[PDB]
């Protein structure tokens, strides 16, 4: 009976009615930091790619024979 | 074409969802949109 009561208490306090909703906020912060790093990486990549693309266009369009 | 507009449409639908939720700093009871 004690084991079953402890199990039911852990069940109801685990995810049934736990007032601790800060886990959602922590997940929000983690995922937002992840997507911000991803966006920054993509932006740096596109900037480098654009620089290289302009440097390549300058040699492609101005060379024909 | 095969992939970009896919992501664009998915993000458009999730933006629709997010817009269907805007906080106007209300006091009495406007409960609407700022630009509205």
């Amino acid at each position: 009976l004690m084991k079953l009561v402890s199990d039911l208490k852990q069940f109801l306090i685990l995810n049934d009615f736990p007032s601790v909703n800060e886990a959602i906020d922590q997940r929000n912060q983690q995922l937002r930091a992840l997507q911000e790093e991803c966006d920054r990486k993509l932006i740096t990549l596109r900037d480098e790619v654009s620089i290289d693309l302009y440097e390549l266009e300058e040699e492609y369009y101005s060379s024909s024979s | 074409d095969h992939l970009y507009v896919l992501e664009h449409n998915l993000h458009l639908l999730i933006r629709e969802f997010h817009k269907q939720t805007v906080m106007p700093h209300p006091a009495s009871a406007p409960f609407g949109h700022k630009r509205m």
Partner: protein
């Protein structure tokens, strides 16, 4: 003399074709990234 010039021109044309083929994918990726990161939020 002239044959060497013709061969060099052919090699340059092949290199320019490969260069255009690479630039096509380059600008495609640039457009894709710049248009996908713009629809964010």
């Amino acid at each position: 003399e002239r044959r060497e010039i013709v061969e060099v021109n052919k090699k340059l044309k092949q290199k320019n074709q490969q260069l255009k083929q690479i630039m096509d994918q380059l600008r495609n990726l640039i457009w894709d990234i710049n248009a996908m990161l713009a629809m964010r939020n």
